[PDB]
Short mmCIF file of C-alpha atoms in Angstrom, two decimals:
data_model
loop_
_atom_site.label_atom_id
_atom_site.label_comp_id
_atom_site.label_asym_id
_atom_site.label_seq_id
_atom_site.Cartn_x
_atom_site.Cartn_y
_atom_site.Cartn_z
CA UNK A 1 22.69 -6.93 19.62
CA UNK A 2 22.50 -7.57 23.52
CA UNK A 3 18.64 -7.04 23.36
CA UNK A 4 16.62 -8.46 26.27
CA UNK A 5 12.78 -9.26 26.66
CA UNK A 6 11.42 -7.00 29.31
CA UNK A 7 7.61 -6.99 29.17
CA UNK A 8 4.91 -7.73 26.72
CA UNK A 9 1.25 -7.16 26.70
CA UNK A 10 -1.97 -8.06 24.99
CA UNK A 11 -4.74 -5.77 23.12
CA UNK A 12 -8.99 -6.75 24.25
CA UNK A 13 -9.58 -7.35 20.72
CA UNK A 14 -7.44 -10.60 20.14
CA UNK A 15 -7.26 -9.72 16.24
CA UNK A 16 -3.96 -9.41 14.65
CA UNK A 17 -1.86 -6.33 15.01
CA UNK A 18 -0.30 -5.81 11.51
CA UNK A 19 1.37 -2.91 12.11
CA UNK A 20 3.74 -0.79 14.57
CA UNK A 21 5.46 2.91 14.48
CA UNK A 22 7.74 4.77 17.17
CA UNK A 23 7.30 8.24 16.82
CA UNK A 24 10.35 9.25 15.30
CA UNK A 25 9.40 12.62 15.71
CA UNK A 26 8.62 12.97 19.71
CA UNK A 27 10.38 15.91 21.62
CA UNK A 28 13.47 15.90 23.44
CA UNK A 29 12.90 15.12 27.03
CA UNK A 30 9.41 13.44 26.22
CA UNK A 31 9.01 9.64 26.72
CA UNK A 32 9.39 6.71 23.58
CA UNK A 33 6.18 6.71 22.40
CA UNK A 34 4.65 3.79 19.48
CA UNK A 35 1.68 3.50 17.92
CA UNK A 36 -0.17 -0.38 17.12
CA UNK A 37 -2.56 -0.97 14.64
CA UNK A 38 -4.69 -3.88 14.11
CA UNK A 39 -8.90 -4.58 14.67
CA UNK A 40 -10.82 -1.27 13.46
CA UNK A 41 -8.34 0.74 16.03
CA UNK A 42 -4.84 2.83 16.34
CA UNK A 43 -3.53 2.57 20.32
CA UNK A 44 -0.64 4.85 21.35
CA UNK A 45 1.64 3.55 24.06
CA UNK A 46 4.74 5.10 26.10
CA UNK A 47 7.82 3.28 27.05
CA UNK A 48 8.76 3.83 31.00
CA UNK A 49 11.70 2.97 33.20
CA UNK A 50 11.19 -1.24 34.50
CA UNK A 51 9.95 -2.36 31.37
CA UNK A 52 6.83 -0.57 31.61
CA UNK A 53 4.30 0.20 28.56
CA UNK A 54 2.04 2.68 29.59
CA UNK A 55 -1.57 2.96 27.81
CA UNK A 56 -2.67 6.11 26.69
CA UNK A 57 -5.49 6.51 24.34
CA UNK A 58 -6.91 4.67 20.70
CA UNK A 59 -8.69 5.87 18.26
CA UNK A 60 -11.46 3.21 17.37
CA UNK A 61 -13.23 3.86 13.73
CA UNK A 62 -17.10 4.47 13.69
CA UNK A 63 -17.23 1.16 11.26
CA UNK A 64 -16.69 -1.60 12.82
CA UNK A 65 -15.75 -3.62 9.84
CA UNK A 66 -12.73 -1.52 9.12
CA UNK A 67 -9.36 -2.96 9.66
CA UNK A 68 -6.31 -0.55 10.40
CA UNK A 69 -3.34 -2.45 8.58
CA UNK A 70 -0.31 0.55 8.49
CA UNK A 71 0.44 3.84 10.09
CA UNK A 72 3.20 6.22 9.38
CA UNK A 73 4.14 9.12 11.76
CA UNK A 74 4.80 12.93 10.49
CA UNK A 75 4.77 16.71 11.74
CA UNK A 76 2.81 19.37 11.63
CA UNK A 77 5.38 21.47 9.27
CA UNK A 78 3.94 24.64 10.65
CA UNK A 79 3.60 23.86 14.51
CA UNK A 80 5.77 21.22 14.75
CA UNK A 81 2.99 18.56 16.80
CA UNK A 82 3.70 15.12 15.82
CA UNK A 83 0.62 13.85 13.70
CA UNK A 84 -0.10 9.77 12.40
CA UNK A 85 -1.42 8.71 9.34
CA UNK A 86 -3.15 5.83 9.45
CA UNK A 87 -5.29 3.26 6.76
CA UNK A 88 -6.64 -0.11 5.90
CA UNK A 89 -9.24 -2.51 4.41
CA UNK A 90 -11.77 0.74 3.88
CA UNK A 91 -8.84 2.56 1.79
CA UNK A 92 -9.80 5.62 3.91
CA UNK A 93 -6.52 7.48 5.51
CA UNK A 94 -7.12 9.13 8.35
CA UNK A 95 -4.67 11.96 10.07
CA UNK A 96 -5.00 11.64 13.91
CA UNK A 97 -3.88 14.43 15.88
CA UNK A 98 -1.98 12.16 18.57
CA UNK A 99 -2.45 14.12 21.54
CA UNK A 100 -6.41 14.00 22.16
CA UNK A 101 -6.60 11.10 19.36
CA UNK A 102 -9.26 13.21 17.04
CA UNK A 103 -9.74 12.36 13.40
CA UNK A 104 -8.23 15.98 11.93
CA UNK A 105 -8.75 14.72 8.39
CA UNK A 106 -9.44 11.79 5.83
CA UNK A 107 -8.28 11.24 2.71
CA UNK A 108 -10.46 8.58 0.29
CA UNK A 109 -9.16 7.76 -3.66
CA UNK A 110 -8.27 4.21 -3.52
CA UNK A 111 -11.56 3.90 -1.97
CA UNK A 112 -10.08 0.08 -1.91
CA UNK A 113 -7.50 -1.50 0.54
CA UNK A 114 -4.51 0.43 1.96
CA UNK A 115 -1.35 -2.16 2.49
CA UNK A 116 1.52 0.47 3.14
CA UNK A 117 2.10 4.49 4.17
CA UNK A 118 5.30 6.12 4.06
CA UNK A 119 6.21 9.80 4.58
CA UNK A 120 8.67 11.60 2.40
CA UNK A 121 11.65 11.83 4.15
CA UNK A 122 12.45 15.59 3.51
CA UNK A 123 8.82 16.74 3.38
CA UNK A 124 6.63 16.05 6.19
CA UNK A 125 3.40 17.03 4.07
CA UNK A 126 4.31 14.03 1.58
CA UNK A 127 2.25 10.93 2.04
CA UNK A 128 3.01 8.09 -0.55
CA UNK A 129 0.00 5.47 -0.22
CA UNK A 130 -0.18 2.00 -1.90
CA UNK A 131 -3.42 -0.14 -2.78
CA UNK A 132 -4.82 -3.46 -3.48
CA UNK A 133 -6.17 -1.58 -6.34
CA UNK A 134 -3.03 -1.93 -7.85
CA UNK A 135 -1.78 1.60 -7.68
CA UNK A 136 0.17 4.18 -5.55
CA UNK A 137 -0.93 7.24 -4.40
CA UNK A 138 0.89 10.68 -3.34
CA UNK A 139 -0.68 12.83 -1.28
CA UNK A 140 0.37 16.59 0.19
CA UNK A 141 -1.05 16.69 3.14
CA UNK A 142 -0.44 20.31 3.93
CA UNK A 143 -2.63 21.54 0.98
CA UNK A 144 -4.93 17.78 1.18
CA UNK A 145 -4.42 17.67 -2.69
CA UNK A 146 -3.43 14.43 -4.62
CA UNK A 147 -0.27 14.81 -6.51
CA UNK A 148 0.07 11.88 -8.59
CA UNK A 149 -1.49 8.80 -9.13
CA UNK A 150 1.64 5.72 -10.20
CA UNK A 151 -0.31 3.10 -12.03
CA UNK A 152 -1.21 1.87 -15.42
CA UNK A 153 -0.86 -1.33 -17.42
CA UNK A 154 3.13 -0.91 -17.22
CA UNK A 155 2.56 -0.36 -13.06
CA UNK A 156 1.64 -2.93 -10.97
CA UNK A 157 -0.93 -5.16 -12.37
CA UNK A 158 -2.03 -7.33 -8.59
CA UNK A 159 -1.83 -5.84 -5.38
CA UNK A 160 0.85 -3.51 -3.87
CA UNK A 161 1.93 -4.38 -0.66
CA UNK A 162 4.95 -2.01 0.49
CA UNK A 163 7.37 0.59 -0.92
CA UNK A 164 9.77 3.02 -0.07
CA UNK A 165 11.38 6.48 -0.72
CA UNK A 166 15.14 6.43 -0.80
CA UNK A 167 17.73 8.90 1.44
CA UNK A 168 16.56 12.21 -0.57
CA UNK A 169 13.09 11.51 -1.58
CA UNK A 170 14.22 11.11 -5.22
CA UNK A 171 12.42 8.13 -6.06
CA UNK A 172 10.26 5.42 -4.47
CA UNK A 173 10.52 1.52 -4.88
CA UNK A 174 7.13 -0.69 -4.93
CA UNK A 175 6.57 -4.25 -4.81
CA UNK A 176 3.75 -6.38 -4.68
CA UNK A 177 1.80 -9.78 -5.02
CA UNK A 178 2.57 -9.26 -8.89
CA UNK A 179 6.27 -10.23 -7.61
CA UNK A 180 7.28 -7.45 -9.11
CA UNK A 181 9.50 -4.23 -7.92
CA UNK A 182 9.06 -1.03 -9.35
CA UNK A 183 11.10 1.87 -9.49
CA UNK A 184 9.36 5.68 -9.83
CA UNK A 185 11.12 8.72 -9.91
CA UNK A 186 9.86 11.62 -8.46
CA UNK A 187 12.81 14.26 -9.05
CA UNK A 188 11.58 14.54 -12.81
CA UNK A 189 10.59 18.12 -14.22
CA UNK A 190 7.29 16.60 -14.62
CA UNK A 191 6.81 15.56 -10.89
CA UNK A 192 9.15 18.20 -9.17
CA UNK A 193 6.56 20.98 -11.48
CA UNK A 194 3.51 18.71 -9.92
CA UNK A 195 4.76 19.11 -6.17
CA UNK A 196 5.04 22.84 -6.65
CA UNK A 197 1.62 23.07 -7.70
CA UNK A 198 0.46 21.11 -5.50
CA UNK A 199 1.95 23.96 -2.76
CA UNK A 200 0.15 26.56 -5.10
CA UNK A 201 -3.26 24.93 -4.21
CA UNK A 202 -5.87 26.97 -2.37
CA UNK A 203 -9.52 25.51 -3.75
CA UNK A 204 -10.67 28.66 -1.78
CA UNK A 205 -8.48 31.29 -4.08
CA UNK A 206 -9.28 29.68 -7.93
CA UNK A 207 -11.84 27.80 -9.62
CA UNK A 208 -10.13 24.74 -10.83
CA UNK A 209 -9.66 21.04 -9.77
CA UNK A 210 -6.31 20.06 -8.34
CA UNK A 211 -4.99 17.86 -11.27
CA UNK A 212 -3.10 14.88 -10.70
CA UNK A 213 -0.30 13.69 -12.50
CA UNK A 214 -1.33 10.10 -13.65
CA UNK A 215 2.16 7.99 -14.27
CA UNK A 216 2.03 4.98 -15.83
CA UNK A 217 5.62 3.46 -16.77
CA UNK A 218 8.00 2.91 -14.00
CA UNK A 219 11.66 3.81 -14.50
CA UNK A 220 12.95 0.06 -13.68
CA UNK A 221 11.06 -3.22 -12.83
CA UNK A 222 12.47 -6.42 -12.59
CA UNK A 223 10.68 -9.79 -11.54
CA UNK A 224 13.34 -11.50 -11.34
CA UNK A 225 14.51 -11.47 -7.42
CA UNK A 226 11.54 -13.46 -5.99
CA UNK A 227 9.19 -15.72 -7.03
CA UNK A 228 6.11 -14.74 -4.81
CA UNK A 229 4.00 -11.52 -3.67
CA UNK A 230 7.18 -9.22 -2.30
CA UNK A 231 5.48 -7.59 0.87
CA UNK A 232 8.66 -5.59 2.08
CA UNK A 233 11.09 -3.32 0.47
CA UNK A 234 13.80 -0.96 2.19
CA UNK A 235 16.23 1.48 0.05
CA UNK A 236 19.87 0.65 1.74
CA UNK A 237 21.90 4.10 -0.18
CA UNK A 238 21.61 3.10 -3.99
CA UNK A 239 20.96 -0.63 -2.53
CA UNK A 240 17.28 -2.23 -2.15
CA UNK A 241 16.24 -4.70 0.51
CA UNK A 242 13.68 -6.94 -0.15
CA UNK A 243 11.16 -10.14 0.66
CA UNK A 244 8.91 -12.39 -0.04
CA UNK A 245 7.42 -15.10 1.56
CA UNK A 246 10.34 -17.53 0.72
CA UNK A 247 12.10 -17.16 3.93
CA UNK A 248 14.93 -14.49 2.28
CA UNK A 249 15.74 -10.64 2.46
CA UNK A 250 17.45 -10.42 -1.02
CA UNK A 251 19.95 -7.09 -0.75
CA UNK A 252 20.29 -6.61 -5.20
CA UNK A 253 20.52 -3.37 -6.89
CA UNK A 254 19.21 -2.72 -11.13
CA UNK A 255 21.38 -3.32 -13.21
CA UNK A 256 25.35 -4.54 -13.45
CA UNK A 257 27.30 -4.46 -10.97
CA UNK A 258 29.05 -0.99 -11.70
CA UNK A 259 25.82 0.45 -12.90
CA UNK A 260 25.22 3.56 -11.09
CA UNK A 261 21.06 4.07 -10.24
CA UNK A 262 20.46 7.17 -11.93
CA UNK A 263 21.96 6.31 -15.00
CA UNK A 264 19.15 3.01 -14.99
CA UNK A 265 16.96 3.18 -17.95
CA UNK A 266 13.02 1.39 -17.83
CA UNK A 267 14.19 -0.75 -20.16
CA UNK A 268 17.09 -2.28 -18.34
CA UNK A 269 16.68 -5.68 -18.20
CA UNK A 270 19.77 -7.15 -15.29
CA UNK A 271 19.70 -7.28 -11.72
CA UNK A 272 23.07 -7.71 -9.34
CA UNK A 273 22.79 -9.77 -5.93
CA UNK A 274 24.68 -8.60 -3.59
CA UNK A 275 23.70 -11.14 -0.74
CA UNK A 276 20.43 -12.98 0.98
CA UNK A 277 20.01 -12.89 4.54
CA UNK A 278 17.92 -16.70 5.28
CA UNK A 279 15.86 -17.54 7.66
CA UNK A 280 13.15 -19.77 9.10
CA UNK A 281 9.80 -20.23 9.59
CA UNK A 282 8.25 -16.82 7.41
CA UNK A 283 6.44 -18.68 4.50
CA UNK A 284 2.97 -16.27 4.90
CA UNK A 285 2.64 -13.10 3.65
CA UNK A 286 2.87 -9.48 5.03
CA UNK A 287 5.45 -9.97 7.35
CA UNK A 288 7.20 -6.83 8.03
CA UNK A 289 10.80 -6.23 8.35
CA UNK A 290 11.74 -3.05 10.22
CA UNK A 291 15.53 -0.54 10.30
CA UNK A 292 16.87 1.52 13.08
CA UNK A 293 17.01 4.96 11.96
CA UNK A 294 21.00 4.97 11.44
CA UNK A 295 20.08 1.68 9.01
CA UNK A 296 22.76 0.15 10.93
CA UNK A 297 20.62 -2.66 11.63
CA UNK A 298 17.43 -4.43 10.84
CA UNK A 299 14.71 -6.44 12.27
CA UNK A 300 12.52 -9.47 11.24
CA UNK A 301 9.80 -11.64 13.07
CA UNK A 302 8.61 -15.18 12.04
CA UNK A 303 5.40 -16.94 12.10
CA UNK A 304 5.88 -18.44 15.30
CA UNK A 305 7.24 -15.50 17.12
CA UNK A 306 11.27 -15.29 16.36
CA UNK A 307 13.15 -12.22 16.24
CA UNK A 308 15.83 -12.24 13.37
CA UNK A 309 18.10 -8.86 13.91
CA UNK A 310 21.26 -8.64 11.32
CA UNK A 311 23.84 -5.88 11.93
CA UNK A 312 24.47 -4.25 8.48
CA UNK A 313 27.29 -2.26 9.95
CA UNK A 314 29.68 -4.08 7.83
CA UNK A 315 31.82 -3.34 4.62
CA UNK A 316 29.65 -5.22 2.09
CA UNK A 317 25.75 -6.62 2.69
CA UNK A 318 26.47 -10.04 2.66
CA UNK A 319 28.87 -10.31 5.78
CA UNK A 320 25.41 -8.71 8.09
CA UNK A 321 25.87 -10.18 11.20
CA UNK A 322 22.94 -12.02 12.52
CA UNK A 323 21.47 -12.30 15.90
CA UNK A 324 18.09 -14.23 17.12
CA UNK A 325 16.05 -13.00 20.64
CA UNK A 326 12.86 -15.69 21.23
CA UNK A 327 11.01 -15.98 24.63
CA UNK A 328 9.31 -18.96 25.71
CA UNK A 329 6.03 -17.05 25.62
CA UNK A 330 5.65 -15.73 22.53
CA UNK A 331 4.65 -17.83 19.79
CA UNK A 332 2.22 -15.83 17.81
CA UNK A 333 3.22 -14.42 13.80
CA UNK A 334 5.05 -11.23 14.43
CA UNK A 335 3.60 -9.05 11.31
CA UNK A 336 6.20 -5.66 12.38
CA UNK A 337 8.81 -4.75 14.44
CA UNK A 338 10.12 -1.32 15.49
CA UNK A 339 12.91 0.38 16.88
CA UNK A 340 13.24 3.54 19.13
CA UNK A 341 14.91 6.41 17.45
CA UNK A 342 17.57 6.18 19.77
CA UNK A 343 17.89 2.76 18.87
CA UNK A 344 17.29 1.05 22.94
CA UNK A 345 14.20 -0.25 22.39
CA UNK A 346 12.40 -2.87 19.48
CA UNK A 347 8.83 -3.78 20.32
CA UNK A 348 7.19 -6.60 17.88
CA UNK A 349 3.56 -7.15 17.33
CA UNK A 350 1.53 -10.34 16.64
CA UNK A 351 -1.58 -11.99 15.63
CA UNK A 352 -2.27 -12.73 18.44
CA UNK A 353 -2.53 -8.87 19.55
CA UNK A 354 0.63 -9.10 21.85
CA UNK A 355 3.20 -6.58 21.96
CA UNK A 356 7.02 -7.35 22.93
CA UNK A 357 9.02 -5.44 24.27
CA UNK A 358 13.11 -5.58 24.15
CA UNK A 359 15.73 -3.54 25.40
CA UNK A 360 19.05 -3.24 24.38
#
């Protein structure tokens, strides 16, 4: 839509900035508020009246050779304060308590790479990490126990680079430089038991371990939509977005056409197209697309510093409405994009460490 470039700004470490969050979560009356990552650091930044991005405060890691990739906002589910997960290259996640920027708590299992977060989005305590160690991880954060571990010869075998939950939390996508996209469910007896526990877990009250649930065969996988590393996926209803590096989003779903998801079985072997939104100029990978928080629309950069934006507030995926926003300044690879809960603002972030801002 009628977006317009209205200020952009640069980070003193000149590394790339692979990752950007609005707090979806900030209080009513409060400023817009995003979080960047990139270099060994998280920055928090507020949106003001004039185009201005205010500054507030990082968090830089004691290593210096760590590199921040992702970060996912949540809650406190007891106080309500916004807190923001974030991870990288030293598969460490870290919870920062945004307000004075403190390390509250780490979490280590991967103790290799972190490519993607993502909070459950019914349970704030819920954190679903994924690895170059070829494996995702769920973590409840409330009790800092590790639910399950999704891996296994039949899970990813390179590695993964994004996933998702769907609407209720019911079941996550993967995908990864295996070109492959996984389906898990987590509304099993087996996993819905394992989340219970992991709410039952006091190491302070009993003498055992917290035991994880290892699963190792995914309910669907298909490599069969692209034919490189797939380093985005989005759930759209019973619909999955996806990319690659191949200058597509592919919008498919498992199965026939008719086939309803939760009737899938893991040994379903068809996929249905429903539509490919093309573009230009995105042949590297881990290049982020980005939704509103309606999912009426979505948001792609380039590698030299395009905005893509389709409208998907239309009666089938493949009549998305697409609209382009470039500025003569901004050339750098855009690895993420962001938009405001309310929708009126998308920054982008590059490898350049630049941040754009654009109002609609």
């Amino acid at each position: 839509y009628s977006f317009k470039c209205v200020n952009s700004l640069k980070e003193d470490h000149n590394q790339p900035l692979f990752g950007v969050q609005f707090n979806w979560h900030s209080k009513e009356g409060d400023p817009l508020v995003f979080a960047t990552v990139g270099s060994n650091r998280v920055t928090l930044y507020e949106c003001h009246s004039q185009g201005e991005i205010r500054l507030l405060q990082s968090y830089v890691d004691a290593d210096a050779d760590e590199n921040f990739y992702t970060c996912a906002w949540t809650y406190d589910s007891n106080t309500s304060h916004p807190l923001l997960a974030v991870a990288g290259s030293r598969g460490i996640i870290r919870i920062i308590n945004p307000i004075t920027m403190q390390c509250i708590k780490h979490y280590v299992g991967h103790g290799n790479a972190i490519n993607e977060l993502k909070f459950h989005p019914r349970d704030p305590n819920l954190l679903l990490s994924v690895s170059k160690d070829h494996a995702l991880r769920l973590w409840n954060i409330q009790t800092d126990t590790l639910v399950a571990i999704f891996g296994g010869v039949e899970g990813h075998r390179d590695e993964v680079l994004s996933a998702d939950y769907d609407l209720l939390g019911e079941k996550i996508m993967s995908c990864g430089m295996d070109h492959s996209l996984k389906l898990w469910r987590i509304n099993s007896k087996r996993m819905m038991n394992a989340i219970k526990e992991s709410y039952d877990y006091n190491p302070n009250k009993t003498n055992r371990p917290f035991i994880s649930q290892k699963i190792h065969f995914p309910d669907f996988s298909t490599r069969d939509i692209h034919r490189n590393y797939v380093d985005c996926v989005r759930w759209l209803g019973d619909l999955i977005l996806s990319k690659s590096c191949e200058n597509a989003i592919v919008c498919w779903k498992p199965g026939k056409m008719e086939d309803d998801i939760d009737k899938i079985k893991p040994s379903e072997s068809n996929v249905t197209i429903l539509g490919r939104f093309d573009y230009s100029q995105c042949d590297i990978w881990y290049m982020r697309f980005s939704m509103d928080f309606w999912q009426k629309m979505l948001a792609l950069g380039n590698q030299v510093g395009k905005l893509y934006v389709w409208d998907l507030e239309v009666e089938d995926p493949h009549k998305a409405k697409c609209t382009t926003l470039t500025h003569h300044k901004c050339g750098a690879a855009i690895r993420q994009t962001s938009f405001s809960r309310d929708s009126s603002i998308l920054i982008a972030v590059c490898d350049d460490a630049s941040i754009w801002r654009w109002d609609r």
